[PDB]
Amino acid sequence: YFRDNGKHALIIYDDLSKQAVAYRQMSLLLRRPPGREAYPGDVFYLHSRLLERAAKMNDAFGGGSLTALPVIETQAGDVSAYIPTNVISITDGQIFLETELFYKGIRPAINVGLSVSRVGSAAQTRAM
Amino acid sequence: YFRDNGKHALIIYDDLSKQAVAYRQMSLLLRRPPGREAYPGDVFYLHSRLLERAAKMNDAFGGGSLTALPVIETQAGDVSAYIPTNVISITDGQIFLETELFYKGIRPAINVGLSVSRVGSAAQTRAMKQVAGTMKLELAQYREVAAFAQFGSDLDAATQQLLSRGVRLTELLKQGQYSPMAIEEQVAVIYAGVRGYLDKLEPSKITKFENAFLSHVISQHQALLGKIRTDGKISEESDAKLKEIVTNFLAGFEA
Amino acid sequence: YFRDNGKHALIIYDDLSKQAVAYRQMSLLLRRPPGREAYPGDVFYLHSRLLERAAKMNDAFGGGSLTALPVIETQAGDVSAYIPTNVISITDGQIFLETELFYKGIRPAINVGLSVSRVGSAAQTRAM
Amino acid sequence: AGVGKTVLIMELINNVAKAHGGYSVFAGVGERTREGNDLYHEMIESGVINLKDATSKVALVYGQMNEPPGARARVALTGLTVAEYFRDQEGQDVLLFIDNIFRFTQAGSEVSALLGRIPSAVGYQPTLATDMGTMQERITTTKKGSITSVQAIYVPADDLTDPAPATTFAHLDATTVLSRAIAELGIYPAVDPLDSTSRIMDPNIVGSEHYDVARGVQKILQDYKSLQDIIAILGMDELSEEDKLTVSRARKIQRFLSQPFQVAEVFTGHLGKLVPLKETIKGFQQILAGEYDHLPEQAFYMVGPIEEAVAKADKLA
Amino acid sequence: AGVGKTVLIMELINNVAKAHGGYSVFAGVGERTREGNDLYHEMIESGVINLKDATSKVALVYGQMNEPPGARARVALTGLTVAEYFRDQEGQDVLLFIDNIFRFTQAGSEVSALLGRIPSAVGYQPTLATDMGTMQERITTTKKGSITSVQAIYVPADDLTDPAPATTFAHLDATTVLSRAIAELGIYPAVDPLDSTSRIMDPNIVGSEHYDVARGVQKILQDYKSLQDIIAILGMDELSEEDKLTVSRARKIQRFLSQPFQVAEVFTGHLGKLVPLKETIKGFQQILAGEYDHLPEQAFYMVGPIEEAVAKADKLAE
Amino acid sequence: DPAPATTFAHLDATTVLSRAIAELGIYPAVDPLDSTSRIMDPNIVGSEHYDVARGVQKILQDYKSLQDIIAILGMDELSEEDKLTVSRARKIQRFLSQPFQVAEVFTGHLGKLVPLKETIKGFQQILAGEYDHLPEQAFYMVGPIEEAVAKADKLA
Amino acid sequence: ATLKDITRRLKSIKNIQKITKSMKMVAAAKYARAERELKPARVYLCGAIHSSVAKQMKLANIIYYSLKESTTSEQSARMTAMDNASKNASEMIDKLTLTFNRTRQAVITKELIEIISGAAAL
Numbered sequence A, C: 001y002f003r004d005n006g007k008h009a010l011i012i013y014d015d016l017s018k019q020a021v022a023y024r025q026m027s028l029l030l031r032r033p034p035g036r037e038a039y040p041g042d043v044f045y046l047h048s049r050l051l052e053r054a055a056k057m058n059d060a061f062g063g064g065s066l067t068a069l070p071v072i073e074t075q076a077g078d079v080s081a082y083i084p085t086n087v088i089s090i091t092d093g094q095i096f097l098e099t100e101l102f103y104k105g106i107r108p109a110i111n112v113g114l115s116v117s118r119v120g121s122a123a124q125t126r127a128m
Numbered sequence B: 001y002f003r004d005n006g007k008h009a010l011i012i013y014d015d016l017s018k019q020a021v022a023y024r025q026m027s028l029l030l031r032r033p034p035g036r037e038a039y040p041g042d043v044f045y046l047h048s049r050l051l052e053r054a055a056k057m058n059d060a061f062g063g064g065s066l067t068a069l070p071v072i073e074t075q076a077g078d079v080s081a082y083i084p085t086n087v088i089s090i091t092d093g094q095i096f097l098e099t100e101l102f103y104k105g106i107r108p109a110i111n112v113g114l115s116v117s118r119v120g121s122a123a124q125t126r127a128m129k130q131v132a133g134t135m136k137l138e139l140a141q142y143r144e145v146a147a148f149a150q151f152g153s154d155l156d157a158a159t160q161q162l163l164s165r166g167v168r169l170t171e172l173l174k175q176g177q178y179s180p181m182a183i184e185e186q187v188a189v190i191y192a193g194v195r196g197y198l199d200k201l202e203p204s205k206i207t208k209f210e211n212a213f214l215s216h217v218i219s220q221h222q223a224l225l226g227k228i229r230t231d232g233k234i235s236e237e238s239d240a241k242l243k244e245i246v247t248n249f250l251a252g253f254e255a
Numbered sequence D: 001a002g003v004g005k006t007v008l009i010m011e012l013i014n015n016v017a018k019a020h021g022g023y024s025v026f027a028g029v030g031e032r033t034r035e036g037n038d039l040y041h042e043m044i045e046s047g048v049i050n051l052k053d054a055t056s057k058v059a060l061v062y063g064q065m066n067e068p069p070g071a072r073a074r075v076a077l078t079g080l081t082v083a084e085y086f087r088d089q090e091g092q093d094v095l096l097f098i099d100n101i102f103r104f105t106q107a108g109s110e111v112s113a114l115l116g117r118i119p120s121a122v123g124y125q126p127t128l129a130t131d132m133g134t135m136q137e138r139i140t141t142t143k144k145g146s147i148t149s150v151q152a153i154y155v156p157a158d159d160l161t162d163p164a165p166a167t168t169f170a171h172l173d174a175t176t177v178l179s180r181a182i183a184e185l186g187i188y189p190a191v192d193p194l195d196s197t198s199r200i201m202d203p204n205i206v207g208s209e210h211y212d213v214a215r216g217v218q219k220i221l222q223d224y225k226s227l228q229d230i231i232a233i234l235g236m237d238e239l240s241e242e243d244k245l246t247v248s249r250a251r252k253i254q255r256f257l258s259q260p261f262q263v264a265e266v267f268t269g270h271l272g273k274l275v276p277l278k279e280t281i282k283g284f285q286q287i288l289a290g291e292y293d294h295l296p297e298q299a300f301y302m303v304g305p306i307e308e309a310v311a312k313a314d315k316l317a
Numbered sequence E: 001a002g003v004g005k006t007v008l009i010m011e012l013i014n015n016v017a018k019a020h021g022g023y024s025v026f027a028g029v030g031e032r033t034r035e036g037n038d039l040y041h042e043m044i045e046s047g048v049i050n051l052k053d054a055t056s057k058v059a060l061v062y063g064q065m066n067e068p069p070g071a072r073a074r075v076a077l078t079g080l081t082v083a084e085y086f087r088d089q090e091g092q093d094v095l096l097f098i099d100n101i102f103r104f105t106q107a108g109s110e111v112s113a114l115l116g117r118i119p120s121a122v123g124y125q126p127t128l129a130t131d132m133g134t135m136q137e138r139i140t141t142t143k144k145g146s147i148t149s150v151q152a153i154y155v156p157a158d159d160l161t162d163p164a165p166a167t168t169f170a171h172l173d174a175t176t177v178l179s180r181a182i183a184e185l186g187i188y189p190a191v192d193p194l195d196s197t198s199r200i201m202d203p204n205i206v207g208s209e210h211y212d213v214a215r216g217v218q219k220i221l222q223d224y225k226s227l228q229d230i231i232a233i234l235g236m237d238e239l240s241e242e243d244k245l246t247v248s249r250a251r252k253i254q255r256f257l258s259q260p261f262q263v264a265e266v267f268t269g270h271l272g273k274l275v276p277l278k279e280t281i282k283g284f285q286q287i288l289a290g291e292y293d294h295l296p297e298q299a300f301y302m303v304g305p306i307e308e309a310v311a312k313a314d315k316l317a318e
Numbered sequence F: 001d002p003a004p005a006t007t008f009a010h011l012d013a014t015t016v017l018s019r020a021i022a023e024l025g026i027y028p029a030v031d032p033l034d035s036t037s038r039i040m041d042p043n044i045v046g047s048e049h050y051d052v053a054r055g056v057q058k059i060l061q062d063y064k065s066l067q068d069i070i071a072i073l074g075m076d077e078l079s080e081e082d083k084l085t086v087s088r089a090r091k092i093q094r095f096l097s098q099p100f101q102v103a104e105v106f107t108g109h110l111g112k113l114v115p116l117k118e119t120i121k122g123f124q125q126i127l128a129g130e131y132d133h134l135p136e137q138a139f140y141m142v143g144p145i146e147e148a149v150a151k152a153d154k155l156a
Numbered sequence G: 001a002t003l004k005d006i007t008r009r010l011k012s013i014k015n016i017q018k019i020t021k022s023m024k025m026v027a028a029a030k031y032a033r034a035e036r037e038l039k040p041a042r043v044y045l046c047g048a049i050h051s052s053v054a055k056q057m058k059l060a061n062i063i064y065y066s067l068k069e070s071t072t073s074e075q076s077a078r079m080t081a082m083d084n085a086s087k088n089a090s091e092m093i094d095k096l097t098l099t100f101n102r103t104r105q106a107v108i109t110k111e112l113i114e115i116i117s118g119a120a121a122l
């Protein structure tokens, strides 16, 4: 609504892991064929169609925008698992929070080295 | 029948691994839904309903009892597999056997660190309690350092004593097949070890020692073996007489 | 044809891994229930039948022969996998190659400890 | 087992009853008949149950192991209903012990399995998270009161990333870790001070004071642990002023973390102690400061309020 | 696959069967046809089979890999029934060789879904253990006659826990386990001294010296086994002169365990040696006692009796 | 995984990227021991090229086998031969990295398009030991071997 | 990846951690004594220690001084070496237990899905 009407909105999806498990409960109950980690074939589409909807419209469509901050819980920093890689393959970068940094008291516990932003520089203020 | 009429029975189920396979056979052929390893959802209930019938009845119900020793075969050590997972949780404890221990010379191949009895002392006589507590502590200390053994080329006398007790005791835990010993004979040989009398004997000899010593006390010192029961524990006398016997004997043993 | 007319022929089956995949397809589409790794129960038979057809005939039968060199692709070097082992358990030996030997410059990348011939010197001249 | 668990549970009951008026409910999910009767008769002897006068503070709900999956899958629910009564009708702060949460998930799995459903990762039921979420949510603070749940957790294959445990972690706010090593040091309760954790350990919630003390105790303890190595090898003889104080203080705090449970009396022959949250904070706060450094270790061992540490000391000289 | 089952069972027919007084039965089940042809012609040469008269002492039954599942699922019963006759209708000591009894199980799994069954673990039919039990319980000595059975048993993907091999273990009285890992080092027969067992290995049966030696060998082998990966990283320098001394004798025993087989001449390029029990015990006794500490490890690799490794030691000079 | 796995047989040259390489900062994150080409033949690319490529691959595989040891004891127990392989291997690893035009934003470097001959030359030289005196970081993120030198000087 | 493998490696690498751990302790004690005797004496696998002196290598008083410095240095280096080596082993154990549990999970799921697929095609 905001995006298409020249306004700017920010949605936070907390978290997509739990949504994927609910969708898995639906799928196995539908008897769809289980694959990696017993997730259905379409778990990627489940998130992709969703996150493609966040976007930046140009001036001819009102210049609004919708920003998305999806959230994915990993198990023991395993960012190579199915779901985590799936969302990594959709979004424009990631902020990684390490268990180590947090417990060691570093807050926010961001792993600067493994976090990315594919399209943020252009949007970063010149002052920064 | 024995449990309900003031009698006590022991039941060994060898094995529950196979009963589960038979039950799974029937379950799959009856087209019931398969689960982990293709077992039916009520496989845990099969065993639980079996093992709970094992029990200690109160005086009002005759005081009889049924003890059960269910066997389970693991595959390449996997205690987390489905049927072992289930039977481990149903039971009051586990005696874990290991191949590596077996071939090393440890037989029965029981793993003292991992086996447990939640009942523990509650069903251990006072004499055995006494010596067993010391041995369980010492062995536990041993396990901690047991790795530094073959590489600790400068171990302090403290850690070096832990090692000596630990080899000594491990050896006293070895035991020939088909020769179950009486409780009093067990405390007597454990006593030897936990009292340090065998700290000087060479490890290879301890097995020969035990066999001679035990044959000797069984022969000449019956009276001491009965006292060990009577008193319930190691009496102040028993504790002196043992000291005389082992010392002299050992001396003769290393003549 | 050669085999049964006193001639000698050599046949390379490159490769039997893909053949098994094509069988699996056909089988599943014919509505036959899948077995280990999705492959049909008789996947060994699929290959067993085939490779027994390679043989040495006696003089009464023309003395011709069929020699076979089936090829099997492993994944990540596991020669102790279902299929692989199915085929090893059929042929009269196996030449196992490896990328690590290959890159160390051992080419042909034959792994001597894992390769064998079940015919031995009976297949060599006296010289060799 | 063998780490004082049944004793902890019994104390919590008795402690929440005396200081909050709320009762406790104990749900035994796949209890073993033997341990159940033992837990009963041990409850009677501790007083938390009374076979005569209505002083009983705990209600027991038992779902035994010989029962079909659906029964053992429901029992936490039953016990949860009892606990709900005290919350919604009597406005109390109920305690709900669930032993153990792992066997609630398993019964969950076995039920689904008989119901013909496709299992999910690692074999658990498709509805693992929902099965879990619908029982756990009933456990909260409402306008009339609250239910606080102490639930025993088994971790399959020692794997914290297993679906079962990871699901449970979703709803836990704190963890009490009982350890054999600590028991061995005669420290009772055998609570490991560095593993046990709590979400509400934020200054915004327990206040800045409580927070700083807790961190102070946690730190002093981490440093000591580290020193161990040097102490034994390089010898505890070259420790600077700052280094010897840590070791002495650490050991007072550590011993001051022990505490005679009112339920232990029946055997310990010693009056149980219930310490108020102010004495706790203040007590450790002072030790940290060094205010009681002029006291012997054994003065803090198995005492109550800080006062009792000094007392005992003078007596022990 | 390819560790030595068949070589070893060929070696056993060569030694035990050739000297055997009584009949013998060989069932080739789900194996290679060429092997059938190999064996047949080898037995005609040794006279064990005679085509010109009635002196034949071995009956053969074949159902190899080129046959469909039903055949391979029933051949072993065919082999077995012939042997059963000789057993009951004669009481005479009957020898039964079956290579490979796994093929009875694999055959079943092969038609299991067409039979309508939900699969069990690892793809096997749900009746695996019962199917195996009704068959194996016929392969047995009885009060009437005795059968000495030797069954080659395939192990899928080298995993001994696989339903099939795993379920076969309790049907036996002695098990010889082969390892690719060992084979891979050139030790043949590739037997695993830490995984091969026998009901009769009891001091009150093979006597004390026999029992003691054996136990002694397995202990020195298990000791070394548990150090290998360790010193592989840390180094040997920390091992005391007593420990590093055992590592020498472990390795020697390891190799003294190999033995050239008559039947494997084409593969070893060595003359087959055969060693009597007594000389076997002495060889190993001696090694365990430090005696041949002075000989090189390779002396022990691929020989017969201990004396051969002493010889070889000398020849190793140049 | 079925998909990728089945895809390898449809290609003439493959470029297999790696998460562990990228994580080390190496870009493009190509795995030098898992990317192949049917053209990699002495009668097609010529012996000089073929040789150098095989040389690089052997030193990388050699390094890789040593990793099992390095991991626990570190480099102290390596023969002087071994160490040599480790130093060159590491300068080969880095010199395989290269600033892309399209990734200027993330590398903070100007793009580089290195001609084949120049690629052979630089790798030949590292194999020869010609630059055994430059520091690893010199070889990271440059174009032609010449820049590795210039970058070395800058470091001093 | 293979449960058999990983378990083996874990057994080795767990041993290696303890052994190395104890070597650090021995080295630490030796060094401590040495350090004490350091100054007094100055009045009259061990890491890269051996390596260093040898690479560069291409009565009483001197012998005593040299040897005294050497021992101190050696025992210090070896203490460091083992400290690092045991630390490396711990980290590696941790990372293999993770791997072991991922594989364990995947295996269980994989066998499960095979079973259900075959049941469902009936």
Ligand SMILES: Nc1ncnc2c1ncn2[C@@H]1O[C@H](COP(=O)(O)OP(=O)(O)O)[C@@H](O)[C@H]1O
Pocket (backbone or CB within 6 Å): C116, C117, C118, C119, C120, E001, E002, E003, E004, E005, E006, E007, E008, E188, E189, E260, E261, E264, E267, E268
């Ligand atoms: N006793 C032996 N000595 C030397 N090589 C052997 C021996 N036994 C087997 N081999 C080698 O291993 C190969 C596989 O043995 P084989 O018995 O055919 O495998 P399987 O156990 O599958 O039947 C043989 O062709 C031979 O090269």
Ligand SMILES: [Mg+2]
Pocket (backbone or CB within 6 Å): E005, E006, E031, E099
């Ligand atoms: Mg064979």
